[PDB]
Structures are given as structure tokens and as C-alpha cells.
Scaffold this active site. Structure first.
Site, short mmCIF file in Angstrom:
data_model
loop_
_atom_site.label_atom_id
_atom_site.label_comp_id
_atom_site.label_asym_id
_atom_site.label_seq_id
_atom_site.Cartn_x
_atom_site.Cartn_y
_atom_site.Cartn_z
N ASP A 334 1.85 -24.76 35.30
CA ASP A 334 2.44 -25.93 34.63
C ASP A 334 3.66 -26.40 35.46
OD1 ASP A 334 2.62 -27.58 31.84
OD2 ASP A 334 4.62 -26.73 32.21
N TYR A 465 11.73 -32.16 32.68
CA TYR A 465 10.99 -33.43 32.47
C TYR A 465 11.89 -34.65 32.55
CZ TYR A 465 7.21 -30.72 30.14
OH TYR A 465 6.22 -29.83 29.83
N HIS A 523 -4.73 -24.61 28.28
CA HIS A 523 -3.47 -24.76 29.01
C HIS A 523 -2.72 -23.44 29.32
CE1 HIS A 523 0.11 -26.54 30.52
NE2 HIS A 523 0.82 -25.76 29.70
O1 LIG Z 1 -5.02 -28.61 26.32
C1 LIG Z 1 -3.79 -28.67 26.47
C2 LIG Z 1 -2.79 -28.32 25.37
C3 LIG Z 1 -1.53 -28.64 26.05
C4 LIG Z 1 -0.27 -28.55 25.53
C5 LIG Z 1 0.81 -28.89 26.32
C6 LIG Z 1 2.18 -28.81 25.70
C7 LIG Z 1 3.14 -27.81 26.33
C8 LIG Z 1 4.33 -27.63 25.40
C9 LIG Z 1 4.97 -28.95 24.96
C10 LIG Z 1 3.97 -29.98 24.44
C11 LIG Z 1 2.83 -30.16 25.42
C12 LIG Z 1 0.60 -29.31 27.63
C13 LIG Z 1 -0.67 -29.38 28.16
C14 LIG Z 1 -1.72 -29.05 27.34
N1 LIG Z 1 -3.08 -29.05 27.62
#
Ligand SMILES: O=C1Cc2cc(C3CCCCC3)ccc2N1
Ligand SMILES: O=C1Cc2cc(C3CCCCC3)ccc2N1
Lengths: 546, 546
Positions: A334, A465, A523
């Protein structure tokens, strides 16, 4: 009722038995049957082997005594040992061929998971051979999984002497009828049986495990594939490096070998790598699992600019400088995945190899504002919700347990609608107050994240971010470059934001790029699919990072 | 008046200049003079080399562009490059041959020691070659010794452009007349001279240094041999391992390579190894400098039994287990030296190699009480004074500054009479209240020990001497053993307690033992003779511990 399980090392937890090699050597060399075995046990409780197992002498002092016993046994049997006969060579090979009996270890792990006190009880020696590290590695890997390791050479007692059994019972703080004892030597089972212990003569592992599950009433054979070894935070080596006057970086450290630096994403911890740390260390690497700036025991300054990619990368370079590391392999997920691609672009001399989980490398568009780009894709809306200082902190810090329980979920368990998070007013507006526990996490693992985030909250993490414009300007300087160092891209089929297809053009900028792909993975890659993450990373590390 | 010194890397801090290789290759290959140099500088500020130095492209992207320029320059000159001509090969060799110009580094260190702000200003590239670690190691070693490192490829500016000079002045927070600038390229000196900076054209180092000392008024040439690099505590990576519920061990960590575990004596610190830590890391080792149990940031339980050799060794084994280290080389001094010989006797599989400074290996006499033995030698009286709990703590904790100032002295500076310490009533009875500072230590180094000992005092440290009977009983189990792993004994001529002659019979128990001997060295070996300690340890590590 049983509450303790005791295992022998040779022929039980480790295979093939070093003992079986004497029989094999006799057969390969057409020597009289049991000649080597007879010379090995020569003098019984007064012989060299007993002195060796009691710790009176070391293995290297024993080698010449064994050679002499082989000579005497040979003389009596009216036979002759060949010119090149080496006890050292036979034992070096035997010890080197001996590997962990994985199904026996798994049964021991299952019993311990169900509340059993586990121990290894072994007749062993003080190994001072030039090649002793092989067996030291074997013992290190095995022992961590048990409550006690009792070695004859350390306790000055040997199996089958009754005193070692009384020593074992005292160590276990258990009566003999509460103990199951597994040994491949009938003579060594006897005294435990004599005291009232459940004993299992181990020939083939399978039958021993059927006997073991029959007496414990716990399923050990045919059970589902187990999760990789995890980390107990209080059992790790914790490192602290000051990278600048107000910034200190925290990391967890395990293993020897090339430095592998693990970089988590948002909103995570070094602990997000819990299933990779023991596996990568066991695979021959020195693991450095970071708490990234803004997280856990690492400093969390309030200023937005403290979290731009340029500053973060510079501090990671300083982190290496201060540890005396000329390079590390950088593995990110990430936000950590984004940082590792930038570490490769701006500091290739410091990056041995680069790997990313989910996060693709996408070069900055010089003709589009980074803001314009994020807005175009409805899946990236949650990042716009993160822009305004305070809004996301308030929602995320409101109830920590709910935050991590709502976020850390597999692809199916998803409780969050990330479509128009701003218009909905928050990430958790349609999420329950008391989310159910995901199959990926225990209550305890959630509580570790809860306690970690109590120190600095979500400001520093959210600031990662809040540098879209700064990052874009810095990234634009790298537009003429290519990543030509070893690189691995790992995609996750069910990541609905960091979709596998976003990585499709990466070969234009990383021509020698290697890939991994994980089916049915969301994720939270590391905890969603730990076994497959470890298999992909270990294979790529062994081929591309040495 | 000067307060800043700026050095170029190539041809100034590092030799031979990579630039000089193009001239050499032309001559070795009988190519037309300046052909390779002409292809290298092709297109001037618009050429591949400028794009490379500005960080627009990486070194691997530049290699094919240089090869093409060599082709064009060749065509014009009506000549031909041979079949096996490789730019990569020429540069790999040039970069690999380039070493630190030690006298230039020493001058830079001397200026910095005298209050100067120092910087490296260089025209360099983003190195993504498979062999990039060599140069990354060179930059790591060099940069630590300077306040700033300004690299063209990172700043997007190049020498001789005026902007990089204005960038330098802003970094230094100095007016051009406060700066001396050393460069081997006349063209790159010009803009600094133009701004009003003192400039030195560096051809031979010696003349450059005469010019440098003439303008600074500080002696740089012909100065005494400098002490090895030391440690600033706040600039180190600090590690913490819990070895049991109430015991945590602290260590300082520097370098990559085989783990070298440093074990100090009484009453010391990880900081007693300050002159060895940077040297051993630079020699290719992963250094773990311990705070031993009872010291500094390590736990200090009150109980005497917590400090017997058996317990201490077991905890050091657990320390390795928790770090994921199957082995470490164990190097000890005084009490740490005693611990390392016992680590080798009881845990050879965990000890890669063993070295001791001053402390000899003497096997326990089973027919003599350890107490009887200590009493026989008048030099060991101070150990009898240490027996009664509280007496020595009171005297040692009374005034910490006086304690370390009285103890840490060279052989001649000795202020203590250790003859009948008990009858005299204490160690410091004939010692001044305000001892003079020994030539071995600064006031600051003393203050670090003072602050360290403020946490737990002298109880835990003194308890190391209060287990004579426990240690003797445990040691007696090893009487039939030999140390057969690599071992180094280092004697110090002027240690009046741990006399070199006490080590004379060691070959009876360690037949393959290696030796080192230090002339005019007292008890405090590491700080008394740092250069020679480092030379002996590095040589033995490279030959016996890999
Ligand atoms: O499938 C998915 C689920 C998911 C959740 C997130 C979040 C990380 C924490 C803050 C909100 C966004 C980011 C990407 C993905 N990809
Ligand atoms: O030459 C020497 C001087 C010296 C001093 C000591 C001290 C260590 C601190 C406590 C009192 C004894 C030990 C050995 C030697 N050897």
C-alpha cells in the site's frame, strides 16, 4: 487427563534418525551387521558415547574415541575397515541429512495451541565441529515452538537413567499421568511408562500421530493446512534509530543474512508483517520490520510536509546510514509499496532489490494535477475524504476497536462502501457499531493495533495522503528514468482499489520486472494470504536478492 | 576567517579519479588521445553526461548513450574501437579501483574537530549497476565524517553551473569568504573563486594539504596518528531484547555481515567498545555491543544468583534465539572475557569464534575452593573487598565522576593501590577527591559512564564477583572438555592483575589457540590501545571467523 507432550529429537522431531546411518554405512560398505552400532554403544554407561551425551566431552573429542572403538570391534569380528573410513565424514553427512519432521512439529504445535505444555527431551552432544552451525540452525528453528528443551549434555543426565525423567516431570510441573512421551527407542520409553506416563513408540510418523490423537482426543492427522508462524511482540528484538532531532524510527529485527526492510501501508504497523517475519528469517534473511513514520513506536510529528515521499525516503536512507547498511531489499505494501518504488528511483545504490504488494508503479503525469487524476477514479474517493485535516482523524480515532474491525476484513466480509465516502459523510456510516471479527484476525491482534494507535492516533498516518502535489512535483524529476535493479510486483485479484490491471503498463518503466499473483486476496495481502505471500517473496529473494 | 571546508569526491576524497581512467584506457588500447574523454563530454550541457549528473537518467541508461558517443567520435577521427570494447567493463573497473584518499579524509576530520562545518560537493550519478554496492559502501564510509553531502543527481544541478554554488552556500549558512573549496577540476573551482571562496586546485594531495593548512592556520600534514572513529550514543541503533520476564538486554548495533557480539567487563558499558564498533562494522561485520546484565539500559535485578555464569550464559543464548541468530562471534574483556570462554565450553554450537582481551582461560581447580585461590594472589584482594554486599556499592556510588576518573587510567597514571584494599578500607582511600582526567578519556566520555551508572548503580555489576562458589561448581562439569572452535587470546603487557603470564598454559585446553599481544597496554585495553585492538581483532576475524 493429559496436559503435557514430550518429544524426542532424533527419529521423532527430526528425520532420518542419525542412528539409522550407522546401519546404512555398514550395508553400503559391506561391513558386518551392527559393527558400527556396537562400536558406538561400546562400554555402555562408562563408554565414550555416554560421556559425550552427559556433556563430559565434546563431539570433536569423541570422534577419535569412536574410531578406536570401531578398530576394537573390527579386530574381534576378524574384518577390516577400508583405507578412507572417516567417522567425521559419516556423522557430518548424517547430521546434514537430518531435517525437521514437519507433520510431527505440526502435531506438537496443535497440542500447544490447545493448551498443552510441550517439551523436547533429547540425548545430544556439545557440537564443536567446523560445520556445527547446521545443527544450531535446526535446534533454533525447532525449540521456539516448545515450552522446554531438555538436552542430556546440558543436564549431565542421559536417557534411559531414571533421574532425567524425574528432572522432566519437575520441569513440566506435571504428574506422570498428565504426560504423553514419544520416543523411537523402546529402551528410552520404559522408564516413562514405569512412572505412569503415556508412551508412544515412534516408528512411522503416521501411526505415532494416530496413537497421539487417540490419547489426546485432539485431531492432529488430516487437519487443515496451518497458518505460518506469527510474532509475539514481547518476544522480538526492538530497534530504535534517531534519523533527525525530532524523528526516531522503530523496527522489529529477526534473522541473519541480507537485510530485508519491510514497509507497511495505511493504517498499519510492523505487526502487519507478523506472518512474513519468522518465514523470511528462516529463509536466510535479516528482517527489519518497520513502524513507518507516524506509526506505533516511531515518531509522529504533526506537520503535513514531514510525510511527503522525498522526506520519508531521505529518512529511510539515514536509517540505513545509522545501522551501517550499504543496502537493504525494500518490500512494501500500500503506502509502503509506493515508498519502495520511489526508493528504487531515487536511491538505486541503497536498494538491493525492490518488491511491492498490491501497489503498482505508475509514473506521474506531468500534464495532469495529481488531484485531477484521483477524482477521475470513483474507487479513490476515500483519499479526497482524507484531504481536510481533522475530519478523517475524528472518525478513525472515535472507537479504535471498531476502526480496525471494520477495515481489516477479507474481500467477502467487506462492511464498507467506499463509493462517495465524502457524500455519505464518512467511511463507517453504513458500518455496524460492533463489527464482527473477520476470519483474518483474532480479538488479540485487533487489540495490538488498538494499543499501538493510542499513542499518536491518525494524524501522522493520514498526512501520507496530504502531499499529493509535493509528491507529484518530486516524481516528475524521475520521468526520464527506468527501474533496472531486481523488482517484483505482486497483485491481489480482489483488491478493488489497487486492482491488478493498474500494474499492466509497469514493464514500460521496469523492463526486467518479475511478477507474483494472488487469487482470492483482498487489500490486506500479508494476513489475507500469508502462506502464498511468503512462498512468492522467498522464491524471488532466493533468485534475485541472494 | 574560514569556518567551512568543501571537498570534491573524485580526485580529492577518492583516488584514483574515475576521470583519469578514460585517458588510461585510450593509452592501453592505443586509441587517439582524448577520444574517450571527448565522447564522455559530448554535447556539453545538453549531452548524456549532463543528464546523468543532473539525475535525469541512471548510469545503466547512460552506458548505451556513451557507447554511441564513442562510435561518433571514433568515426570522425577515422579510427576503430576493438571488437571487445565495453564501457560497462571500463567503468566497473574504474569505480572498483577508486579508494578513499585517507590523508584528505584525515585533514577533513581535523578541520571538523577544530569547529569547521565540512561538506562533500560532487558531480555524481544514480548508480543502478549490478555492482553498485561497492560505491554505496564507499559513500557510506565517507559521508558519516561530514556535515553535508551534496550530490548533483539529487539536487538536479551540476558543477560548474553557478546555482549549485549558491545552493552550497545556503546549506553551509556561510558567506563565500568563510569557505575553502577543494576540487581537481579548474573549471569547477572558477565559480567558487568568482563568489569569493578560497579555492585549492588539487593535483597531488600533499601540496593541496600544504595550501589547506596555510589558509586555515591548522596543522593537517605531519600530525600524530589519529585515534579510530568513535561512537556518538544518540547516533546509534539501540536494540532491546527481553530474555526472561524481568530481564531485558540492551545493545548497540552497527554493520552487516557475521554477527560479532561484544561483551564488556567491570564496571563498564557497551561504550567501552566505542573505538571497535565503527572499525569492525567497516571491516564487514554486524556488531552487537552489549550492555551486560546489571549495566546501562539492561535490567539489573538485585539477587546475587542472577549473576552467576550459568544464568548469564543461558540468557545470552536466549538473546541469540530471540534475534534469530544461530551463532555469533563472542569477544569479551575482563568479566565479559570470562563469560566468552564459558560460552565456548558450554555452547560451542552458538559460538562461531571466541576472543578475549586480558582475561585468560584458567580451568577450575576441583581440589581448591575458588575463595582459597583468590586469597593466594595479593593482586586479587579487591575481589575479596567486593564480597560483602553494600560495602563496595557505598564507596563506588559515593561520587560517580571520581569513581570513573580514578578507575579509567593508563598504566603510568595509576592512582589506586590495589594491595590490601580491605585493610586500607577501600579502593579510593589514597585517591584524590578530584582526580585529573586520564589521557585515555575526555570529560564527556566520563559523563556518559556517570549517567549510565545513575540508573542501577553498582549492585548488579558487583554481583558478577559474588558467585565464586556457584561458578566453580558449574565450571567443574567442563573439566574433561577442550575448546576446539577458533579462539584468540589477547594479552596486555601492563595489566598488573590479568598478567600476560596467567595465560601461559591455555594451549593445554585450547590447542589451536591464536594470540595477540599489546605492548604498553594496561587493563582498559579497548581505550588504552584502540588502533592495535582493532588491527588484532580485524586480522583474526578475517582469517578465522569469515
Ligand atoms: O478491496 C479493497 C478494500 C480497500 C480498503 C482500503 C482502505 C484502507 C484504509 C482506509 C480506507 C481505504 C484501501 C484499498 C482497498 N481495496
Ligand atoms: O593494571 C591493572 C589495573 C586494574 C584495575 C582493576 C580494577 C577494575 C575496577 C575495580 C577495581 C579493580 C582490575 C585489573 C587491573 N589491572
Amino acid at each position: 487427563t493429559l496436559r503435557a507432550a514430550v518429544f524426542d529429537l532424533d527419529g521423532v522431531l527430526a528425520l532420518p534418525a542419525v542412528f539409522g546411518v550407522l546401519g546404512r554405512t555398514e550395508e553400503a560398505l559391506a561391513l558386518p551387521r551392527g559393527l558400527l552400532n556396537d562400536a558406538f554403544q561400546k562400554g555402555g554407561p562408562e563408554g565414550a558415547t555416554t560421556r559425550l551425551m552427559k556433556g563430559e566431552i565434546t563431539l570433536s573429542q569423541w570422534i577419535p574415541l569412536m574410531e578406536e572403538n570401531c578398530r576394537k570391534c573390527s579386530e574381534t569380528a576378524k574384518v577390516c575397515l577400508p583405507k578412507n573410513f572417516s567417522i567425521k565424514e559419516i556423522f557430518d553427512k548424517a547430521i546434514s541429512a537430518r531435517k525437521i519432521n514437519r507433520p510431527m512439529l505440526q502435531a506438537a504445535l496443535m497440542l500447544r495451541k490447545k493448551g498443552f505444555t510441550t517439551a523436547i527431551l533429547t540425548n545430544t552432544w556439545l557440537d564443536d565441529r567446523a560445520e556445527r552451525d547446521g545443527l544450531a540452525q535446526l535446534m533454533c528453528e525447532l525449540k521456539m515452538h516448545f515450552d522446554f528443551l531438555i538436552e542430556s549434555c546440558q543436564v549431565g543426565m542421559v536417557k534411559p537413567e531414571p533421574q532425567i525423567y524425574k528432572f522432566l516431570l519437575d520441569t513440566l510441573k506435571a504428574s506422570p499421568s498428565e504426560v504423553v512421551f514419544l520416543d523411537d527407542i523402546g529402551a528410552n520409553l520404559k522408564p516413562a511408562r514405569d512412572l505412569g506416563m503415556v508412551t508412544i513408540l515412534v516408528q512411522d510418523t503416521d501411526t505415532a500421530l494416530k496413537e497421539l490423537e487417540k490419547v489426546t482426543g485432539i485431531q492432529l492427522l488430516n487437519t487443515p493446512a496451518p497458518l505460518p508462524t506469527s510474532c509475539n511482540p514481547s518476544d522480538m528484538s526492538h530497534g530504535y534509530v534517531t534519523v533527525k532531532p525530532r524523528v526516531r524510527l522503530h523496527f522489529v529485527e529477526l534473522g541473519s543474512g541480507p537485510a530485508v526492510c519491510l514497509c507497511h501501508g495505511f493504517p498499519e504497523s510492523w505487526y502487519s508483517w507478523r506472518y512474513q517475519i519468522p518465514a523470511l528469517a528462516q529463509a536466510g534473511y535479516r528482517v527489519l520490520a518497520m513502524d513507518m513514520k507516524g506509526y506505533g513506536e516511531s515518531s509522529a510529528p504533526p506537520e503535513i510536509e514531514e510525510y511527503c515521499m522525498e522526506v520519508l525516503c531521505k529518512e529511510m536512507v539515514t536509517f540505513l546510514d545509522k545501522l551501517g547498511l550499504s543496502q537493504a531489499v525494500f518490500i512494501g505494501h500500500d503506502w509502503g509499496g509506493m515508498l519502495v518504488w520511489y526508493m528504487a528511483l531515487f536511491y538505486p545504490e541503497r536498494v538491493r532489490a525492490v518488491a511491492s504488494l498490491n501497489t503498482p508503479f505508475i509514473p506521474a503525469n506531468p500534464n495532469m494535477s495529481p488531484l485531477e487524476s484521483i477524482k477521475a477514479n470513483p474507487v479513490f474517493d476515500y483519499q479526497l475524504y482524507f484531504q481536510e485535516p481533522g475530519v478523517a482523524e475524528a472518525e478513525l480515532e472515535q472507537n479504535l476497536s471498531r476502526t480496525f474491525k471494520s477495515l481489516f476484513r477479507a474481500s467477502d466480509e467487506s462492511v464498507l462502501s467506499m463509493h462517495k465516502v465524502c457524500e455519505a459523510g464518512g467511511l463507517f456510516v453504513n458500518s455496524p457499531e460492533e463489527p464482527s471479527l473477520s476470519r483474518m484476525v483474532t480479538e488479540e491482534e485487533i487489540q495490538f493495533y488498538v494499543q499501538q494507535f493510542k499513542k499518536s492516533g491518525f494524524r501522522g498516518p493520514l498526512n501520507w495522503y496530504r502531499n499529493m502535489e509535493r509528491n507529484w512535483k518530486w516524481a516528475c524529476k524521475s520521468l526520464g528514468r527506468k527501474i533496472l535493479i531486481p523488482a517484483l510486483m505482486v497483485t491481489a485479484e480482489k483488491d478493488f482499489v489497487l486492482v491488478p490491471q493498474m500494474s499492466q503498463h509497469m514493464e514500460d518503466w521496469i523492463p526486467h520486472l518479475k511478477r507474483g499473483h494472488i487469487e482470492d486476496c483482498g487489500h490486506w495481502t500479508q494476513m489475507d494470504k500469508p502462506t502464498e505471500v511468503n512462498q512468492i517473496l522467498i522464491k524471488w529473494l532466493d533468485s534475485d536478492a541472494r
